[PDB]
């Protein structure tokens, strides 16, 4: 079916419609229905799901739960074009696909289609969870570069968030933590980019596997403290102290993967995507006809 | 050898849903992704919600800057239409309608139109305003179109802001979006690549005759082709049982798939592999030549 | 369940993980053995990997338990006969 976005997803799960889910999982639903004792012969179960009564949707949510599926975009070129997700059921008729994963599939949303495949046997469910799961493919096999790099909206939300301007609301005030930085942004007393001394507590792990806390006052902005609320423990503050374009957020996720491993990098990739979408929505970053500024010197050059 | 032909015409009414394809007239495609409620829409300081929220980031890379000029000129057209609706809903006499429609039809440089309403005789002007109240249509020929200053002067005739950008509030939080955003009217088309014509699913359907594999297509209730590059992409992982059931149990081997169906409806979750029957077809086609292919041991 | 990283930290091959967890899930599903960790109505695959993460199951312990519970069956048969 045709794909669509659904940005509420965690990156190990994808949205899958109820009609496709009841068609692809007919034998598991038959086995579940025969186990409970609701029906007797197989025919009765096929009439039940042909009618789609009120009790087979609980059966369907109990066959989905921990059963991965293989999503596949139709021109598969490398191995990151078949990835295994966990379904989340969708009122609708379109596969909801987590956005970061799109940069692996070369999948935009201009009319694309993807195929779902079901691992039937038990070794195949374990291969989908342990080799082909989308959390397991965060580095491209051609090199060392991360393939779950945040693509387009989220880097605009970050670049508007962690930046600065020479005067805003709350210029040069002092803040006792990142929590009241977000509280000053939400209440309407400061701006998202307004330079400010905060007190942040960065955890540097300089010992042999022991995280040592160092707390200090960084001359930073409001947005850099709000984004510091999402960074895991081990990364230093200077990973967010800059302006965070796309190369900088890619090496942010890369340094998180090299230091803190896989699980903080998966949960931190999701928190990056969520905060990028949220502050890009709050940014209101349009495009106008006045934004393309003609040079005044252009006509004399011609 | 046919007795009678009965033809029946069903008439479906397909509305809209997440998954259809809409697009403007400049290449801005898109799968509609969420059909929001009315309240969540960004509204402005008049009260009206916006209908569709596009994405700005498609403009500087995909260089179709014409859609933003079309958006601003559409907002100018609807501003003139709203002023006609205001001057007509208050039951005003035809003199003020004649004044305003004449000012909205002159408005430019040396142009081709040059209409005058002094030869419409007080009844056509009311019916012309009955047709203009949902907006005023504007022609813009291809390479001799409306420049920027004419769009600005027409946005000044309505009481809209000059830059085309209204500040917009939020529907969820109820608090203002910073840095005022671009609204207007774009003329968007629904394309007939719908989503309840592409969506398909198959547990177990019919099987082909010469090679015991599932049929192809949607009208024939068929399964999706697990092609060659996907086989390469599963060799590229270490997924070995997934590929074995992906090309022996789920696809070809008939005794294997009936054993599989009994094992799935009994909770077992186990495959008895066997051989693809299409490999036996390969043996019969190579063997039907003078070639003697076998299976040793 | 999201990641299987520690299940590879305790079985370093990442392919032997699939064999050990498949053997364990086949013992729990059809053979009717109790899980050694209390579940939360998870499926048998996640309970297998959840036993791998505790460390109380790998291929060594599975061979030990299959040899001892095969010797127990044959010992019960021999003491029933003689």
């Amino acid at each position: 079916s045709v794909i669509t976005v659904g940005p509420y997803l965690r990156l190990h799960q994808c949205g899958l419609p109820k009609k496709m889910a009841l068609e692809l999982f007919k034998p598991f639903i038959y086995g579940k229905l025969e186990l409970r004792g609701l029906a007797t012969t197989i025919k009765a179960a096929k009439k039940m799901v042909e009618r789609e009564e009120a009790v087979v949707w609980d059966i369907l949510d109990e066959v989905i739960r921990e059963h991965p599926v293989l999503l596949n975009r139709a021109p598969t070129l490398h191995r990151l074009g078949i990835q295994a997700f966990e379904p989340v059921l969708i009122e609708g008729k379109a596969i909801q696909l987590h956005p970061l994963v799109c940069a692996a599939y070369n999948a935009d949303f201009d009319g694309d289609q993807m195929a779902v495949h079901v691992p039937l046997t038990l070794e195949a469910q374990l291969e989908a969870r342990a080799l082909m799961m989308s959390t397991n493919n965060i580095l491209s096999p051609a090199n060392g570069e991360p393939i779950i790099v945040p693509s387009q909206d989220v880097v605009l939300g970050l670049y508007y968030m962690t930046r600065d301007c020479v005067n805003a609301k709350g210029e040069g005030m002092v803040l006792t933590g990142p929590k009241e930085a977000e509280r000053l942004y939400r209440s309407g007393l400061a701006s998202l980019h307004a330079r400010v001394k905060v007190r942040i507590t960065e955890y540097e792990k300089d010992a042999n596997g022991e995280l040592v806390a160092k707390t200090s006052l960084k001359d930073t902005t409001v947005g850099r403290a709000i984004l510091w609320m999402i960074v895991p423990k081990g990364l230093p503050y200077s990973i967010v102290n800059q302006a965070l374009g796309k190369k900088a957020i890619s090496k942010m996720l890369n340094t998180c993967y090299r230091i803190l491993g896989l699980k903080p990098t998966v949960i931190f990739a999701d928190q990056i995507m969520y905060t990028g979408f949220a502050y890009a929505a709050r940014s209101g970053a349009s495009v106008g006809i006045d934004d393309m500024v003609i040079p005044e010197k252009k006509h004399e050059i011609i | 050898g046919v007795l009678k032909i009965v033809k029946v015409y069903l008439a479906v009414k397909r509305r809209i849903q997440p998954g259809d394809k809409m697009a403007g007239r400049h290449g801005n495609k898109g799968v509609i992704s969420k059909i929001n409620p009315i309240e969540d829409m960004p509204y402005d300081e008049n009260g009206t919600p916006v209908d569709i929220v596009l994405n700005p980031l498609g403009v500087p890379s995909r260089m179709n800057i014409g859609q933003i000029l079309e958006t601003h000129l559409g907002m100018a057209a609807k501003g003139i239409g709203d002023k006609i609706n205001a001057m007509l809903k208050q039951q005003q006499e035809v003199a003020k309608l004649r004044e305003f429609i004449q000012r909205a039809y002159d408005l430019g440089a040396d142009v081709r139109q040059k209409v005058d309403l002094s030869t419409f005789s007080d009844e056509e002007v009311m019916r012309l305003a009955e047709n203009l109240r949902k907006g005023m249509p504007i022609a813009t020929p291809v390479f001799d179109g409306a420049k920027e200053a004419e769009i600005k002067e027409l946005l000044k005739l309505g009481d809209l802001p000059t830059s085309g950008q209204i500040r917009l509030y939020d529907g969820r939080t109820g608090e203002q979006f910073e840095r005022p955003v671009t609204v207007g009217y774009m003329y968007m088309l629904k394309l007939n690549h719908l989503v309840d014509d592409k969506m398909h699913a198959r547990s177990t359907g019919s099987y082909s005759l010469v090679t015991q594999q599932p049929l192809g297509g949607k009208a024939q209730f068929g399964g999706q082709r697990f092609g060659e590059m996907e086989v390469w992409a599963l060799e590229a992982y270490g997924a070995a049982y997934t590929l074995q059931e992906m090309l022996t149990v789920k696809s070809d081997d008939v005794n294997g798939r009936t054993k599989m169906y009994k094992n799935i409806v009994d909770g077992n979750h186990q495959m008895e592999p066997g051989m693809p029957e299409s490999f036996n077809v390969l043996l019969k086609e190579i063997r039907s030549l003078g070639i003697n292919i076998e299976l040793e041991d | 369940r999201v990641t299987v990283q520690d299940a590879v930290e305790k079985i370093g091959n990442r392919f032997d993980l699939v064999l050990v967890a498949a053997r364990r899930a086949r013992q729990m599903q059809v053979g009717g053995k109790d899980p050694l960790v209390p579940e939360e109505n998870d499926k048998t695959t996640v309970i297998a990997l959840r036993e791998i993460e505790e460390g109380l199951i790998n291929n060594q312990i599975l061979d030990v338990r299959e040899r001892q519970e095969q010797q127990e069956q044959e010992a019960a048969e021999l003491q029933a006969v003689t």
Partner: peptide
Amino acid sequence: PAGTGYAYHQDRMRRR
């Protein structure tokens, strides 16, 4: 004989 099946092919190549 590469992925998960390399143990199976080790077993089959050992048992000849």
